[PDB]
Nucleic acid binder design. Sequence first.
RNA 1: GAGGGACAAGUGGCGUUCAGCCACCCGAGAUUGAGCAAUAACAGGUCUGUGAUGCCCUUAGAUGUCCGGGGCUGCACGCGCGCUACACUGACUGGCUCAGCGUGUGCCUACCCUACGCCGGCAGGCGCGGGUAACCCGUUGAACCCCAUUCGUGAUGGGGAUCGGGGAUUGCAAUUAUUCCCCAUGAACGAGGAAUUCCCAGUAAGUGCGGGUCAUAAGCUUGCGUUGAUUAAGUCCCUGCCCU
Lengths: 86, 139, 190, 62, 97, 143, 63, 139
Amino acid sequence: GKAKKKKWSKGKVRDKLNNLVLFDKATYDKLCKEVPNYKLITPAVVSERLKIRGSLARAALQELLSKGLIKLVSKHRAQVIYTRNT
Amino acid sequence: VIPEKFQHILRVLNTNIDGRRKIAFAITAIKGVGRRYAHVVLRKADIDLTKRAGELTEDEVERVITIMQNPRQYKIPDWFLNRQKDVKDGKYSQVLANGLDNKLREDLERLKKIRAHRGLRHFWGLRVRGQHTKTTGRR
Amino acid sequence: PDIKLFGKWSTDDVQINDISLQDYIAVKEKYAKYLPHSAGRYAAKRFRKAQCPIVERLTNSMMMHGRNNGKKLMTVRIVKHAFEIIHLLTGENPLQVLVNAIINSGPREDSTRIGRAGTVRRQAVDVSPLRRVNQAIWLLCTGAREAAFRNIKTIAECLADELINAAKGSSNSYAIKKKDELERVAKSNR
Amino acid sequence: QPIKLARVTKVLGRTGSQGQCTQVRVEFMDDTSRSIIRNVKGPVREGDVLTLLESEREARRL
Amino acid sequence: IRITLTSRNVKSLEKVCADLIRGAKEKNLKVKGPVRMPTKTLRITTRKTPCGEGSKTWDRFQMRIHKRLIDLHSPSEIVKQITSISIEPGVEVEVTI
Amino acid sequence: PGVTVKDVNQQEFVRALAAFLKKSGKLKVPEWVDTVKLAKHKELAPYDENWFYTRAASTARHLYLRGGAGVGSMTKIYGGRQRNGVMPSHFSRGSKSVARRVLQALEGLKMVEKDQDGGRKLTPQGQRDLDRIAGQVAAANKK
Amino acid sequence: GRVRTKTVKKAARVIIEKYYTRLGNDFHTNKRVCEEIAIIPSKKLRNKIAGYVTHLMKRIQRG
Amino acid sequence: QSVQVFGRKKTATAVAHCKRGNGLIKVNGRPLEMIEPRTLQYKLLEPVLLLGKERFAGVDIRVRVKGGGHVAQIYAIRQSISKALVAYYQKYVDEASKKEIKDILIQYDRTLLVADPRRCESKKFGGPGARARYQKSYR
RNA sequence: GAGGGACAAGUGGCGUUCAGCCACCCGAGAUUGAGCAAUAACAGGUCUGUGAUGCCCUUAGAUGUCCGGGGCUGCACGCGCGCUACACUGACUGGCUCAGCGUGUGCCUACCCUACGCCGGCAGGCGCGGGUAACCCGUUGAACCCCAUUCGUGAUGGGGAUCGGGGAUUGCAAUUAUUCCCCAUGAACGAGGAAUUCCCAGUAAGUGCGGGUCAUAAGCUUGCGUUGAUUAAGUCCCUGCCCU
Ligand SMILES: [Mg+2]
Ligand SMILES: [Mg+2]
Ligand SMILES: [Mg+2]
Ligand SMILES: [Mg+2]
Ligand SMILES: [Mg+2]
Ligand SMILES: [Mg+2]
Ligand SMILES: [Mg+2]
Ligand SMILES: [Mg+2]
Ligand SMILES: [Mg+2]
């Protein structure tokens, strides 16, 4: 029937914002170019700053971890802690 | 490392549109497929669960649709299916997205001819399993 | 024989740059415990709560809102991530900038009602230093919670961001936002 | 507009419609031995150094 | 051969236990101790009222069942001699050979 | 040196013991667990494909801990929170066919001895196997 | 919360009126002296009476 | 030369059998390094990380706990170690060093030697908890 | 089981010799929670608790008492006590690990608690054993929590309402209500205006267990455990009450 609610707060963050499932060619190439420039390598910063989902972000961070460019400090439940040497 | 595969939007059974998050959770979008049936069909198709919907072979898509339309040739015993013995035919089958609503309409159409009060409460604005409807069922 | 240390830390030479908050922050050597999860019995006497360490107070105020009410192991884990994130962000030790953030977390005076049984005017009066510490920790944990509400960022990540942006006056943290919201009303009702 | 510091000598009593403020005759460090009475809300003892934002006011009651 | 002494209240329990000790420790019998059992409690909660008026005020009735056991290895003729005791009525005696 | 499974962390021990049971082939899996079998009373299936070997390793560790458990005892050892939805949760028990399956499989592979009072207990062959596997997991830990 | 009853204070006043040489400044001795010179059923009442007896002894011996 | 010291957490009792040896801590057959919460792997080591290693390698203590909760068992093991050292330094080592190490333990933390009388209160017949009541109904 | 142990006692200050408040040590505790609970009322409720009862009504086609059904649940709405969510401090899977009250059979008149082994995917069935109980379930291997994987801010895998099909359990019978299990359908809900309830330390809250109901039986309630804070120790402004 009718639709009623007591609060009036519309206009959320960004209009059902999209996020890339799979990495592109030039986008992931730019990611590999500017990825040593960050001081703290965390999956949330890599996901939200660089328009990456969490799954692809963790996959790319584990791939670069196996490559050895980024050192692991202490991994845990959900706060994965990486650091670049020097 | 699978850079890019040109596959975003799929068309399954002429009505359903597959998503892009996974494959075992994009088969969830098909009506007649919920939580466990998709992970059963994935294990019958032997697909690695990390793979997306767009990173998957079209021949393997046809194999998954073959397992959808006929699961009883290989495995998946008679209890796991949705459409059990009460068919008017006795055929143990799994419903489709176009088939599920048609079977529900046939259920309601024969219940209106039976004139059971279950069908009567579904025809009225009532609840079948509504043991209390004082506060429950407003607007 | 060795010095008392939180993780691989030292817990030493953390000097408070001003007065009016000494002997209520337990950063000193006689209150340096290894984990914040201790036997909390600091609510029987009126002034035994000030001897609690501020990291334990931060965990205790971080655990809130029913679904997370309790779970000291979880919130000590969150603070263990947060100190590490603050250290990896350009050094600048997390205990030192935690004390600096408690100093710079806003209210040095607040407005409240006076008597006379007449027109409510809310005259701005002075505030207790204990209440400054309490409101500091409460505003920092509330800002961290609503910053890490509905995002990929974690409670510890937004708590580290809140402590850094509260120790540095960049006007981007919830402590500085409510410092604006309270000190403008306090100067208006002065 | 200076900002001064002050440590508590004595505690007079409690004041308010709730009784929440406390009349504290604090003292003055940076100048000579002057005496005003301010209102502090929250728990307080004697000897607590306190940041003042205005030293010209004097809230007195009899 | 054991004897179970189960009483209603702990005062008469300890009195009949002290009487059994005073009547048993003079003979040539290695008397085992009056082994203390944990106290049983039957908790019954009651509405206190025949009709529903007022706050939820509940009676909480409890008992305190106290049980003791003694062990006396002997021929069966000695046990019947020990059993004959002018006893408090709130004490129950069981024997097991 | 003397290595006991309590001296070694389990979170490496079961993860290696699944592979060392895959190397031996100590698993029976007749038809329904070949097809699909769900959890206690849940919605989804377990993820990591060697979960039958993981159940067998957990059963082996529990029979090393306590001697005399059985089907219902190990079913209560698994334990369950039954999220009923709107109605609140309760303690639900696990499945019984896997609880008899793993015991029958380890009996056929000579790792479960019958107790005349209860159920499973450790065999000397299973004792030697678990002790050597704990020793090599402790060697991988110290290396 | 030491605002003990008139019966407690009056019993202690009867004690300090009748027997003064038997009492001292030690609680552990005065509690035992009161159980020889009076009959008190309750152990908390023993402690209360003996504490007020020690307070009366500290008042009388000083002033 | 063997002293058993007991527990006394809220509902956690730790039997700590202490005896002269070469350095061992047994918690139900499981050593000191395996603490069941990973977060509390500094609090139970507070008798270890503060008092030294020549004391650890001098005193063997085996601990068996039948407690009620995880945190309660951790503090029961902590209090049982901190009291088993006091009992062994009463029964074998002189008081001139026992008083020094007891002053060190007391000036570190009171809860090492002093048990805390805190138990959960009885739930009342009026409300859902010990102090809380149910919601009223006015107009 | 008894006895001991805590009394504002030792010190200093605040106080009229005072009654008494504040800070510390020794101590396990500087005092925890309940039951009983004055004179006197409410013209509060119970005749539907009684073979406790006065008065009035019916008494053989019965307002007595049996048998078969329906009803108390029935919904265009409003209100109260509650349960579950609105997620990332989170959901899924796997491994790991800890309780305490209390209950349980052949009953003053019909009756359980459950170990083990087998079958079945599951709820369940079959055979046998123990327990009238610190003996057996049961060293109540509980939930929460800890570690690892998956999801990635999408009304999403959060929420599981509504609804269709099938299978078992108790009952003589669950259909216009059982209950549980399996699949499937997948709504509102984006942290809630005006107002309002409870609470000062193992306390609120999260979370599970036992009993009462029962034959099958909790979201109610009574008690128990696990994890376990932020704030006060102050006043008469809002409300209620007591005294002159
Ligand atoms: Mg319908
Ligand atoms: Mg109604
Ligand atoms: Mg009366
Ligand atoms: Mg009669
Ligand atoms: Mg409700
Ligand atoms: Mg409910
Ligand atoms: Mg019966
Ligand atoms: Mg339905
Ligand atoms: Mg019944």
